[PDB]
């Protein structure tokens, strides 16, 4: 992935 | 047998569900907390061919006056969801179960919206929330947006960087922090990974982050976020309320109506010229952190809008 | 470079894509084929902040006149390794493609079934939308409650049950199923129940507020064209206008009394196996609506 830290919780419906 | 004129859709363990529940209690109403994560095992839902025919755990909820939609928890990777066990063991069956739950619960929300419920952030807004569409829509309605490139093509990235100068990259949809496009990132072994998934590239705006809350076509407050670059060892964030011109206020309200939200936290950001560009409109914005750090009240006005609907 | 006035979203190895491509070809238009399966790894899409800054494989495609949206993968290893990362990456790809379709529709492109319609297609809401609008629908019960089923059966008589999502044969609810041990398996497996309609199935095709044909169905199925009433033809056009579909195959089923009820509208209905077995022309009028939007 170009965005390395993607998966590594900043989840979907947070905001 | 239970007051459903105001429904809060979220887990009671969610802190903003807690905040809005406490506010609504303090103002004399009792919210029906609708927790989709209890759906199969510890809940009962029944829908008939008629729109008004909705039965949750026995009781009929045809039409609340207003609804606060924190989350429906539609995918295992949603915020308040703890699904890593089930996803590890059988991710296919788990994803299928989540999709099935999502269908019914959405049908419930869309039925409420069809009977006339004021849903604070209808799920129908998601089509417009789609970011590479959202910023274009906003710009074409006259709102400044950053110079942007959503792509999986390394050449388009190299040419965009050459046209703009300093750039950032961030997710197309979400799930990672914004970073600066450094020189290493344009090298082949790095930039070639765009073949896996597209990325959003943007002009590096250098001014300040502002968060503008909009409720029922009125700006509740504009909060400015500043970064403490003083001590490089423990940089803090300082949030303070600020005044904005009527121009900025009306642009934020137009943006909210355009995307199709009733309660939104606009993230805007100023350039070196000191003028704001729209970064995003959030469809389930949080407020407790900003409420605390800026010493302002967002939960109150939201609860008051929800209550105002029951008199409407 | 290529003519972008008519666009076909989907793999060229999809049989309906081939049908529509040849149907447009034999009429004087070469459609641009937007093979989205090659998107991340073998194809380049680029979107700028201006709605018309849409670039596919280097060529700008701002506003096609019409778009036939057919469809929009192997990831088992990735899903076992890190399911959050993989789900997020798929969301990135799908968001870019959805944004393409949405920008086109907002530009004025006639998209044959826009993805926005998905919200109305939601079945437990789609049927209610059709009902409260005066169109005939079977009596239904989406549930996970054994008591609601016991009451629904006692009320409507014989009934059937299909899955919430779909993709399984409709089964007749018998009283063996309603017993304690048997039915208790429902509290974790929500399904749809509906009064059993004994009449025949009909698929009605609508393309631009006009009914193209109606086919009765009864690996050996018999499909033949039917003449349906102007009343039912208008009802079908109205259902498609209400759910928000420029082209649909509506599954309707008659009852014992000879009145059709609307079962479902399909957002990307297939037509190959029907047109063949009934000697009717679906691909034709569809290609014609497509070419019409160019004028
Ligand atoms: N064009 C940009 N220039 C500078 N910073 C940006 C830009 N876009 C986003 N950011 C930074 O990223 C942060 C969050 O990104 P945002 O666009 O709000 O999406 P999300 O909050 O969903 O990640 C912002 O607070 C801002 O600091
Ligand atoms: N109320 C009903 N009574 C009898 N049969 C039904 C009923 N609803 C659906 N069916 C049968 O199920 C089949 C498929 O269901 P349908 O509603 O078309 O959904 P899908 O095709 O997505 O599974 C129909 O062709 C019909 O024969
Ligand atoms: Mg966001
Ligand atoms: Mg943000
Ligand atoms: Mg069907
Ligand atoms: Mg179907």
Q: Which atom of ligand 2 is nearest to the CA of C167?
A: 23
Contacts of residue C99, Cβ cutoff 8 Å, sequence gap at least 6: B130, B131, B132, B133, B136, B150, C47
Question: Which residues in B lie closer than 8 A to residue C96 (C-beta atoms)?
Answer: 132, 150, 152, 172, 198
Instruction: Give which of B11, B80, B176 to mutate to test A binding, by max A Cβ within 10 Å.
Output: B176
Residue B148 has φ and ψ, to the nearest 5°, of -135, 155
Q: Are residues C264 and C249 in the same domain?
A: yes
**How far is it, in rounded angstroms, from Cα B247 to Cα B243?**
12
Residue B218 has φ and ψ, to the nearest 5°, of -135, 135
Write down the residue that tokens 């999809």 correspond to. C14
Beta bridge partners of C162: C192
Number of domains in chain C: 3
Cβ distance C44 to B154 under 8 Å? no
Q: Are residues C122 and C245 in the same domain?
A: yes
Q: Are residues B103 and B50 in the same domain?
A: yes
**How far is it, in rounded angstroms, from Cα B215 to Cα B302?**
7
Cβ distance B260 to B278 under 8 Å? no
Query: Which tokens go with B61?
Result: 């909820």
- Annotation: binding site of C for Mg(2+): 251, 264, 266
Query: Which tokens go with C178?
Result: 């309603």
C39: exposed, middle or buried (Cβ count in 10 Å: 0-12, 13-18, 19+) = buried
Q: Are residues C281 and C156 in the same domain?
A: no
Which experiment gave this structure? X-ray
Q: Are residues C177 and C164 in the same domain?
A: yes
Query: Which tokens go with B219?
Result: 């700006």
**How far is it, in rounded angstroms, from Cα C168 to Cα B219?**
50
C229: exposed, middle or buried (Cβ count in 10 Å: 0-12, 13-18, 19+) = exposed
C112: exposed, middle or buried (Cβ count in 10 Å: 0-12, 13-18, 19+) = buried
**How far is it, in rounded angstroms, from Cα C183 to Cα B261?**
42
Parallel/antiparallel/unpaired status of strands C110-112 and C140-143: unpaired
Q: Are residues B131 and B225 in the same domain?
A: yes
Write down the residue that tokens 């040419």 correspond to. B159
Cα C227 to ligand 6 centre (Å) = 23
Q: Are residues C85 and C183 in the same domain?
A: no
Neighbours of B2 (CB within 10 A): 10
Question: Which residues in C lie closer than 8 A to residue A9 (C-beta atoms)?
Answer: 84
Query: Which residues in chain A (1-15) have CB-CB distances under 8 A to chain B?
Result: 1-3, 5-7, 10-15
Contacts of residue B290, Cβ cutoff 8 Å, sequence gap at least 6: B211, B223, B239, B296, B298
Q: Which atom of ligand 1 is nearest to the CA of B174?
A: 22
Chain B nearest CA to A2, separation (Å): 5
Q: Nearest residue CA, atom 17 of ligand 2? A: C263
Cα B282 to ligand 4 centre (Å) = 7
**How far is it, in rounded angstroms, from Cα C114 to Cα C105?**
7
3-state secondary structure B268-311: EEECCCCCEEEEEEECCCCCHHHHHHHCCCCHHHHHHHHHHHHH
Cβ distance B300 to B164 under 8 Å? no
Contacts of residue C188, Cβ cutoff 8 Å, sequence gap at least 6: B40, B41, C144
Query: For the CA atoms of chain C, what is the radius of gyration?
Result: 22
The alpha carbon torsion through B236, B238, B239, B241 (nearest 10 deg) reads: 180
* Contact criterion met (CB < 8 Å) for B133 and C99: yes
Q: Nearest residue CA, atom 18 of ligand 2? A: C251
Cα B4 to ligand 6 centre (Å) = 33
Q: Are residues B107 and B22 in the same domain?
A: yes
Neighbours of C59 (CB within 10 A): 12
**How far is it, in rounded angstroms, from Cα C173 to Cα C146?**
13
Q: Are residues C119 and C245 in the same domain?
A: yes
Q: Nearest residue CA, atom 20 of ligand 1? A: B174
- Annotation: binding site of C: 123, 162, 170, 195, 197, 201, 251, 253, 264, 266
Instruction: Give which of C84, C93, C94, C96 to mutate to test A binding, by max A Cβ within 10 Å.
Output: C84
B28 DSSP 8-state letter: T
**How far is it, in rounded angstroms, from Cα B63 to Cα B43?**
19
Q: Are residues C38 and C83 in the same domain?
A: yes
Q: How far is CA C209 from CA B151, C64, C182, in A?
A: 37, 21, 46
CA proximity to C70, closest of C290, C254, C238: C290
**How far is it, in rounded angstroms, from Cα B123 to Cα B129?**
10
Question: Which residues in A lie closer than 8 A to residue B71 (C-beta atoms)?
Answer: 13
Query: How far from chain centre, in Å, is Cα B71?
Result: 10
Query: Which residues in chain C (118-137) have CB-CB distances under 8 A to chain A?
Result: none
Cβ distance C123 to C251 under 8 Å? no
Cβ distance B208 to B228 under 8 Å? no
Cβ distance B227 to B287 under 8 Å? no
Query: Which tokens go with B94?
Result: 């788990």
**How far is it, in rounded angstroms, from Cα C109 to Cα B134?**
17
Final resolution, Å: 3.0
Q: What's the half-sphere exposure (Cβ side, CA atoms, 13 Å) at C103?
A: 29
Give the angle subtended at the CA of B101 by the CAs of B95 and B107, to the nearest 5°. Answer: 135
Site residues for ligand 2, CB cut-off 6 Å:
C 138, 160, 162, 166, 170, 194-197, 201, 251, 253, 263-264
Q: Note the maximum CA span of chain C.
A: 67
**How far is it, in rounded angstroms, from Cα A13 to Cα B72?**
9
Q: Are residues B11 and B43 in the same domain?
A: yes
Q: Nearest residue CA, atom 14 of ligand 1? A: B178
Instruction: Give which of A2, A3, A6 to mutate to test C binding, by max C Cβ within 10 Å.
Output: A6
From B111, B127, B175, residue closest to C116, measured CB to CB: B127
* Contact criterion met (CB < 8 Å) for C45 and B151: yes
Contacts of residue C101, Cβ cutoff 8 Å, sequence gap at least 6: C9, C67, C69, C72, C111, C114, C115
**How far is it, in rounded angstroms, from Cα C218 to Cα C195?**
19
> Would you call C95 an interface residue with chain A, using a CB distance cutoff of 8 Å?
no
Q: Are residues B111 and B81 in the same domain?
A: yes
Structural domain span for residue B162: 146-205
Neighbours of B56 (CB within 10 A): 19
């Amino acid at each position: 992935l170009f965005i390395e830290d993607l998966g590594k919780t900043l989840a979907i419906g947070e905001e | 047998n239970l007051d459903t004129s105001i429904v809060v859709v979220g887990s009671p363990d969610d802190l903003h569900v807690q905040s809005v529940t406490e506010g609504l209690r303090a103002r004399g109403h009792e919210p029906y907390v609708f927790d989709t994560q209890r759906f199969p095992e510890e809940m009962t839902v029944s829908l008939g061919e008629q729109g008004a025919s909705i039965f949750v755990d026995g009781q009929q909820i045809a039409r609340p006056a207003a609804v606060y939609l924190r989350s429906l928890y539609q995918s295992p990777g949603a915020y308040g969801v703890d699904a890593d066990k089930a996803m590890q063991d059988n991710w296919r069956r788990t994803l299928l179960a989540f999709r099935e739950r999502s269908t019914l619960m959405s049908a419930v929300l869309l039925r409420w919206e069809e009977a006339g419920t004021a849903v604070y952030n209808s799920p129908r807004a998601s089509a417009n929330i789609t970011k590479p569409f959202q910023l274009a829509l906003l710009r074409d309605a006259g709102l400044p947006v950053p110079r942007s490139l959503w792509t999986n093509d390394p050449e388009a990235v190299r040419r965009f960087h050459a046209e703009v100068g300093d750039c950032i990259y961030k997710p197309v949809a979400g799930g990672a922090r914004t970073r600066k496009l450094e020189a290493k990132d344009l090298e082949a072994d790095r930039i070639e990974r765009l073949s896996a998934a597209p990325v959003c590239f943007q002009e590096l705006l250098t001014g300040d982050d502002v968060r503008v809350y909009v409720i029922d076509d009125q700006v509740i407050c504009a909060l400015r976020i500043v970064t403490d670059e003083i001590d490089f060892r423990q940089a803090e964030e300082r949030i303070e309320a600020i005044e904005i011109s009527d121009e900025v206020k009306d642009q934020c309200v137009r943006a909210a109506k355009l995307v199709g939200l009733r309660y939104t936290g606009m993230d805007i950001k100023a350039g070196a010229d000191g003028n704001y560009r729209v970064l995003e409109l959030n469809a389930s914005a949080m407020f407790r952190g900003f409420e605390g750090r800026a010493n302002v009240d967002i939960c109150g006005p939201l609860c008051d809008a929800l209550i105002a609907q029951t008199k409407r």
